[PDB]
Design a protein around this ligand. Sequence first.
Ligand SMILES: Nc1cncc(C(=O)Nc2cccc3ccccc23)c1
Ligand SMILES: [Cl-]
Ligand SMILES: [Cl-]
Ligand SMILES: [Zn+2]
Length: 313
Amino acid sequence: RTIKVFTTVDNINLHTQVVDMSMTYGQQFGPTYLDGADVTKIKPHNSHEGKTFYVLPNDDTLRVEAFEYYHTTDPSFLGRYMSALNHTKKWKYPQVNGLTSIKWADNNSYLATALLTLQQIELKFNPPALQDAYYRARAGEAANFCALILAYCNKTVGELGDVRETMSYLFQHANLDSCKRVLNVVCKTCGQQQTTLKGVEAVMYMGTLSYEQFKKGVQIPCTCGKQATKYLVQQESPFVMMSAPPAQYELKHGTFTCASEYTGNYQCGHYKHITSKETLYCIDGALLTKSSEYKGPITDVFYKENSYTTTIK
Ligand SMILES: Nc1cncc(C(=O)Nc2cccc3ccccc23)c1
Ligand SMILES: [Cl-]
Ligand SMILES: [Cl-]
Ligand SMILES: [Zn+2]
């Protein structure tokens, strides 16, 4: 007694298989998943005929397909992706003010604010798996995209996460080759040092949330033991992300694109998203509120950019 099924690593290229209904999937394919569910220890049902099963990339055809689709050789990746998808397919993805959000479940507030942010900044993903899942997420079906983020970041469903680190890992799998930043550091004692940064380093800054303040100059400790002024000379990027240790901060309508708020103690707090549109909207998973100004413990602020050159001489 047999059925025909298909095996895959990318859910695009299918491989025809005939399975024995008296043996487990595990006995025939090794670790096997059906829409994220682990079916390794399960025997084929009638209802399985014609269905697609994920298997591990254990031969050269599957390794080429999996590497071209996911751009990772981590042998646990597909198992972690499937384990996460079994949960994320049960999350809800409401449209909030025209953006795909996530209804709160499993400590996912960092993923909701990351997903909302990605829909507001120009970013192209390198791995086809992320490109395809991101397109589906923007259309409202974000389960695959959320499970890929989890898998790529080595996070499990239910784990508390960091928005900044999550964005940094996603930026590392994105095309930021065009991104350039020139900084100047001026110490009235030591003199001045210019630095040029590329890629992820060109779009992320830690120590101030204010892009305006970064342009005017921020005070930092100099290696000589005094204080220096660091300021932005030149920026070439479609956005910048400014971060700082969480502190009470006032967001003003029309001065930024979006921001992350973190409330609570070390590690086990909660994120909300603030987006500047016609007014300020606070998106907290499924929840939406508005205000003319917003003051809270802000961690990350995103700004639109294209090309900036300082007037500072
Ligand atoms: N998501 C989250 C939750 N709870 C605590 C943090 C936190 O403090 N992380 C950081 C560690 C080290 C240096 C940091 C410097 C700046 C900002 C955060 C830092 C982050
Ligand atoms: Cl993309
Ligand atoms: Cl990549
Ligand atoms: Zn100095």
